[PDB]
Design a protein around this ligand. Structure first.
Ligand SMILES: [Zn+2]
Length: 112
């Protein structure tokens, strides 16, 4: 999909990472004693998504949300972010500003 213009992917790319990591440490409470008072203090703990396991102690809402974020980030890596996989067609910019972690258009999201 040649579509560089419209819907600024960079904004969505970073907010997807922000969303997945806060939800990651939320369900990684078992393996992460560190939650911090507010800020991370330092720059960044680059050890994220390094656990290639299912684990039932992870919240299913978080796992599913992170799967949707992972699919969205994978579309960015593929260069076809802003494409409903369930249509093979373009996504609304309003869809992605509200929820960038949907591989489905609002038509499909309401049809789920
Ligand atoms: Zn769709």
């Amino acid at each position: 999909l040649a579509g560089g213009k419209s819907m600024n992917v960079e904004s969505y790319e970073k907010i997807l990472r922000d969303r997945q990591r806060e939800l990651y440490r939320r369900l990684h409470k078992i393996e992460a004693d560190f939650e911090e008072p507010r800020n991370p203090d330092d720059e960044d703990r680059a050890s994220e998504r390094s656990n290639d396991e299912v684990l039932d102690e992870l919240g299913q809402v978080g796992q599913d949300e992170l799967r949707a974020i992972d699919a969205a980030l994978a579309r960015i890596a593929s260069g076809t972010f802003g494409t409903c996989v369930k249509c093979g067609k373009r996504i609304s910019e309003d869809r992605l500003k509200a929820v960038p972690y949907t591989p489905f258009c609002q038509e499909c999201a309401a049809a789920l």
